[PDB]
Design a protein around this ligand. Structure first.
Ligand SMILES: OC[C@H]1O[C@H](OC[C@H]2O[C@H](O)[C@@H](O)[C@@H](O[C@H]3O[C@H](CO)[C@@H](O)[C@H](O)[C@@H]3O)[C@@H]2O)[C@@H](O)[C@@H](O)[C@@H]1O
Ligand code: CA
Ligand code: CA
Ligand code: MN
Ligand code: MN
Lengths: 242, 241
């Protein structure tokens, strides 16, 4: 018997009344959620930002009872592009409930940050798990010099990264958990051939985010582009004694 | 799958995902008090309160041809000094913009307007009621005893089972809807194991809109009692029959 909230989509209907759509995010007739803008043929375009949030607010703690949320999310996406350098990536993310798309964020900032404050942790309130396909050091100075999965804490510069291969049109299955007893954020990603990716980072979520949050996804393209297609998503949060 | 599910083991005075209507308030002991009390914690006359979860429940989805099942568990207790305490608490499913109707503080349980309460064509609601007050002068539709009912677009239950109100005791309820049999089941137990069972065939898809909200309603007219919601969990799943 716990206080908990849980939800799941195996498809995205064109009428999803519990989802908040931001910027260019929209749902295709095929019921795949498309985060970034496409042209009249469904091809990817430049300078686009898209995000979704579930409308239900997630309670991260309740100081009253020393309870902290233990959370768990699963999702699958694929990316596609005619380009040899496809940009910029998709992120699962957690932020205050009134979070909106920052100015200047269509590009390497992933729809998550303003460029005047993107490396200033004091100005942000965001945990993100990114899948980052574009790392050119000329514009994505913060990035490691390869493709990567990263854990972002109030910064576009990841606290931890692991090397990762983008695969044109292939579904990545992802599992993210937060264990509040160990304060650990744990990420496991897998392609359909079993090719596997792991990444963890210790951060106390109560020190970085407010009591009530919203959860969802962000994606962007700058001068380079791709489609960012979310296929499925489930989420559970459970308040647990810590 | 597609699913929505939430749990409250008790209620915190800050609950961002609940819609509160009328007299509904959270007590300092984490009980949801649907009807108004004075500064002595005492019930009052002429009160109605309701909660709904803000998350909308989808009852079917054409794109995938799926239909929703549902299941809810809850516990409440009622308290009054009267030998005829009134009026009752109900779990309900209604359109998402549902609000408390005029004249529902009483035998209408905050769910119906007196002018239209018995007219099916006028209402959109499935409710499971715990009705403590049945006198004919005003509760003409009632059987002549305390009862649990399954209400479909009327204050006159489609089906009832005789029930005993037990002053200050927790009643634990489990409601399920099985979309393949099109059946609402109710099981309610007291701490000593006394059990109540009730069942009605109804197709939610032919009665309710695609998207609904769920929660609770309670009221008091001229007779009174506090209505106290202890805990609530709810799940729903879009599946194939
Ligand atoms: O030779 C001039 C100039 O060339 C290079 O900068 C131009 C662009 O190079 C890359 O394509 C990108 O890094 C791009 O940055 C935009 O697109 C990125 C991909 O979508 C995105 O992440 C960025 O946020 C941005 O929108 C550059 O603009 C480079 O060699 C410069 O040093 C050189 O001066
Ligand atoms: Ca990048
Ligand atoms: Ca009655
Ligand atoms: Mn990065
Ligand atoms: Mn009745």
């Amino acid at each position: 018997s716990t206080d908990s909230l849980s939800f799941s989509f195996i498809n995205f209907d064109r009428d999803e009344r519990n989802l908040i759509f931001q910027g260019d995010a929209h749902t295709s007739r095929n019921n795949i959620l498309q985060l970034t803008r496409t042209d009249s043929n469904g091809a990817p375009v430049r300078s686009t930002v898209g995000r979704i949030l579930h409308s239900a607010q997630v309670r991260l703690w309740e100081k009253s009872t020393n309870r902290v949320a233990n959370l768990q999310t699963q999702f699958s996406f694929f990316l596609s592009s005619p380009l040899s350098n496809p940009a910029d990536g998709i992120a699962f993310f957690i932020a205050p409930p009134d979070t909106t798309i920052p100015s200047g964020s269509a590009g390497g900032l992933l729809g998550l940050f303003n460029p005047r404050t993107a490396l200033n942790e004091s100005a942000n309130q965001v945990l993100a798990v990114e899948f980052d396909t574009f790392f050119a050091q000329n514009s994505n100075t913060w990035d490691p010099n390869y493709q990567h999965i990263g854990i972002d804490v109030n910064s576009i510069r990841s606290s931890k990264v692991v090397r990762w291969e983008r695969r044109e049109g292939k579904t990545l299955n992802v599992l993210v958990t937060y264990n509040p007893s160990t304060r650990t954020i744990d990420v496991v990603a897998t392609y359909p051939d079993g090719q596997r990716y792991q990444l963890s980072h210790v951060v106390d979520l109560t020190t970085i985010l407010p009591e009530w949050v919203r959860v969802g996804f962000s994606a962007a393209s700058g001068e380079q582009f791709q489609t960012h297609n979310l296929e499925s998503w489930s989420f559970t949060s459970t308040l647990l004694y810590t």
